[PDB]
């Protein structure tokens, strides 16, 4: 039973690494390559989704949101004739539910869907990962029923922070948007420092809500760079709380949430490098 075999692996696989082992005696580059290749994709086949006309809202044919964690658009603000967006809820540290939503970058025809999701899910933070569509405005623009305005734009060494507001009827909400460039698909960032500063930027973001909404994280396909970013943050949280990290377990849990998260063995190895660097910053 290939399905049961996949699910059993993802629910049980693990390779705990103490802070010491991570820094001083990590698995060899060959061991990490073989370990990465063993992780099932958990990609859903087009047959496992019965959402007609979903293909026009997917950037890629074979990268699809797993039904169990798929973000469904209730259309409370619109008259749109479906529920579909290529996006999944992602669990965070210790399996906490709906900490993130991983999604593809909006297509010209899914920009309104994207802002609908941001409203419906009470998103206040968006992390965009890219290399050098513009679904946010220069000053002010309307997307479907939503009015979006930019209040501030700040250029940091490695990312740009925009403060936006989104308004529907009487209600206007703040949304922080972080655009991290110099990260090509199927590659790693230039070095781990900027990525760890991005993770810190996210941590430091003020949370106003009583029950915080998911952090939206996106990139072109919504799995490689999003998976690296989310795995990095969860790994840091594990190191800080427990003084050890199970990177294999983190990636397996991400794949349960959205098929294919973290695309390449080089990205998986870079996660180890990044977390070994973060470990040096911890107390003691």
For position 226, which CATH number holds? 3.90.190.10
User: Helices 265-280 and 29-38 meet at what angle, rounded to 10?
Assistant: 120
Residues in contact with 189: Cβ distance below 8 Å, sequence separation at least 6, in sequence order: 182, 183, 195, 270
How far apart CA 270 and CA 281 sit, in angstroms, is 17
Residue 250 phi, psi (nearest 5) = -55, -50
> In sequence order, what are the beta bridge partners of 155?
160
d(CA 179, CA 104): 14
Give the whole-angstrom CA distance, residue 176 versus residue 162.
6
Rounded Cα distance, 92 and 201, in Å? 17
- Helix ranges restricted to H, 243-281: 247-257, 265-280
Helices (H), 26-97: 29-38
Q: Give the Cβ contact number of residue 159 at 10 Å.
A: 19
* CA-closest candidate to residue 173, choices 134, 204, 137, 146: 146
CA 279 to chain centre: 22
How many other CB atoms are found less than 10 A from the CB of residue 267? 20
Q: Which residues are catalytic?
A: 219
173 DSSP β-pair partners: 166
Q: How far apart are the C-alpha atoms of 189 and 71, rounded to whole Å? A: 28
Q: Are 259 and 42 in contact (CB under 8 A)?
A: yes
Please identify which residue in the block is written with the tokens 């989104």: 166
| DSSP state, residue 281 | T
* Structural domain boundaries, residue 256: 1-284
Resolution expressed in Å: 2.0
Residue (of 201, 118, 106, 194) closest to 162 by Cα position: 201
Number of domains in the chain: 1
């Amino acid at each position: 039973t290939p399905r049961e075999v996949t699910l059993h692996f993802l629910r049980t696989a693990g390779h705990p690494l103490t802070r010491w082992a991570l820094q001083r005696q990590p698995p060899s580059p060959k061991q990490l390559e073989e370990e990465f290749l063993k992780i099932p994709s958990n990609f859903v086949s087009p047959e496992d989704l019965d959402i007609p006309g979903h293909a026009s809202k997917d950037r890629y044919k074979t990268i699809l949101p797993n039904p169990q964690s798929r973000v469904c658009l209730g259309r409370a603000q619109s008259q749109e004739d479906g529920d579909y967006i290529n996006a999944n809820y992602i669990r965070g540290y210790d399996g906490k539910e709906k900490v993130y939503i991983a999604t593809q970058g909006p297509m010209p025809n899914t920009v309104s869907d994207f802002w609908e999701m941001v409203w419906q899910e009470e998103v206040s933070l968006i992390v965009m990962l890219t290399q050098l569509v513009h679904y946010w405005p220069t000053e002010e623009e309307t997307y479907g029923p939503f009015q979006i305005r930019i209040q501030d734009m700040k250029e940091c060494p490695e990312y740009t922070v925009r403060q936006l507001t989104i308004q529907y009827q009487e209600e206007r909400r703040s949304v922080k948007h972080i655009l991290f460039s110099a990260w090509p698909a199927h590659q790693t960032p230039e070095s781990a420092g900027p990525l760890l500063r991005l993770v810190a930027e996210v941590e430091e973001s003020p949370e106003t809500a009583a029950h915080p909404g998911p952090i939206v994280v996106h990139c072109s396909a919504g799995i490689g760079r999003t998976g690296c970013f989310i795995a990095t943050r969860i790994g840091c949280q594990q190191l800080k709380a427990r003084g050890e990290v199970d990177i294999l377990g983190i990636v397996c849990q991400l794949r349960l949430d959205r098929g294919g998260m973290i695309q390449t063995a080089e990205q998986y190895q870079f996660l180890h490098h990044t977390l070994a660097l973060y470990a040096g910053q911890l107390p003691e």
